[PDB]
Amino acid sequence: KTMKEKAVELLQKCEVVTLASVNKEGYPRPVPMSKIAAEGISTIWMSTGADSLKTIDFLSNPKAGLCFQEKGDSVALMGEVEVVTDEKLKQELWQDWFIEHFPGGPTDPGYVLLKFTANHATYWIEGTFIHKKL
Amino acid sequence: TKTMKEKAVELLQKCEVVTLASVNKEGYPRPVPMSKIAAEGISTIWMSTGADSLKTIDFLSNPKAGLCFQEKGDSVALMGEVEVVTDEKLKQELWQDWFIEHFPGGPTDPGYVLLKFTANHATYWIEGTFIHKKL
């Protein structure tokens, strides 16, 4: 019944999100991303190549946006990405099909985690628009 | 054989939704799903929005934009610029019935604005292959 409660319920139904970085040229870069894990709408985990355009963007500019949607309801968060290389986290969040993209396995240095931490939310849910700092 | 560009045009024709990013005044990129109202190849992509929308506010001060779309493991990510358009002729030509729910004044509604995205650069993920080209 709470807006954030509906937004959390919406994230739980979404397996993909769209992640945006800002490149050194100043352009925002939205890319579709598999959602590995999320805690509410506060923290969301993804993986990418250490040499990806995403990674190189985030190493210099942490500012980030992320949206998701299902059945005409949508949410866009703003926040920051931390590029995570921790050996224990890489192992913990490893998934089997990751081997396709990261042939070195869970200790592949070409494998990194992206941790997105939200600071704002814009909700387009069930006829209501709310734009709210978190 | 079709080039990455030609493949992307085909992909787009299948998508009725795209994700559009602006950069807000604080430097944060803001991706949002948008209905694709029309497109000319992948070169020009047309969307609609409110005259007072956050997207309109962002683009009025920073034209730099990003747009992506995806169908079935294949994705395309574009970089370019957005112009906010208020041209009466385009407003009426691009009007869709489902706009009534959003712009109660019709194709003449002062609250009704078009977003013209013009692409500069593409990043293709087609056939599990990544290619990053200037347009």
Side-chain angles (χ1 to χ4, degrees), chain A residues 25 27 29 63 80 122, chain B residues 26 28 30 64 79 81:
Chain A
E25 261 200 276
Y27 288 89
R29 290 225 259 243
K63 297 181 179 190
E80 275 81 16
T122 311
Chain B
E26 263 167 65
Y28 290 92
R30 289 189 55 74
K64 289 185 177 160
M79 281 175 144
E81 280 93 7

Side-chain angles (χ1 to χ4, degrees), chain A residues 16 18-23 25-33 53 57 61 63-69 74-80 101 119-120 122 124 129 131, chain B residues 17 19-24 26-33 54 59 62-70 74-81 120-121 123 125 130 132:
Chain A
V16 287
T18 309
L19 205 229
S21 61
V22 188
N23 70 8
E25 261 200 276
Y27 288 89
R29 290 225 259 243
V31 182
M33 305 286 289
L53 296 168
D57 291 353
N61 188 346
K63 297 181 179 190
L66 184 155
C67 62
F68 49 96
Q69 49 89 49
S74 308
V75 173
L77 310 169
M78 289 179 5
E80 275 81 16
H101 305 99
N119 60 27
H120 215 283
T122 311
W124 293 265
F129 172 79
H131 182 66
Chain B
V17 163
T19 306
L20 177 64
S22 56
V23 184
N24 82 0
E26 263 167 65
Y28 290 92
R30 289 189 55 74
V32 65
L54 304 162
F59 289 129
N62 187 347
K64 289 185 177 160
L67 187 153
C68 68
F69 56 95
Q70 67 157 19
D74 279 349
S75 73
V76 177
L78 267 22
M79 281 175 144
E81 280 93 7
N120 289 148
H121 197 97
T123 300
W125 182 34
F130 279 123
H132 322 88

Side-chain angles (χ1 to χ4, degrees), chain A residues 28-47:
Chain A
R29 290 225 259 243
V31 182
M33 305 286 289
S34 179
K35 179 194 91 194
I36 297 179
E39 308 175 11
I41 54 173
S42 168
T43 66
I44 298 135
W45 289 93
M46 302 155 277
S47 69

Side-chain angles (χ1 to χ4, degrees), chain B residues 104-120:
Chain B
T108 218
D109 194 313
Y112 160 39
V113 142
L114 298 158
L115 305 174
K116 184 175 176 194
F117 176 90
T118 301
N120 289 148

Side-chain angles (χ1 to χ4, degrees), chain B residues 28-77:
Chain B
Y28 290 92
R30 289 189 55 74
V32 65
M34 304 286 291
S35 306
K36 173 203 79 190
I37 83 194
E40 302 155 56
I42 62 171
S43 297
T44 303
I45 304 166
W46 290 98
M47 294 149 285
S48 67
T49 191
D52 208 36
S53 70
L54 304 162
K55 278 280 164 294
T56 297
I57 288 163
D58 294 347
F59 289 129
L60 285 182
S61 100
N62 187 347
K64 289 185 177 160
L67 187 153
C68 68
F69 56 95
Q70 67 157 19
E71 221 154 270
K72 282 173 92 281
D74 279 349
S75 73
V76 177

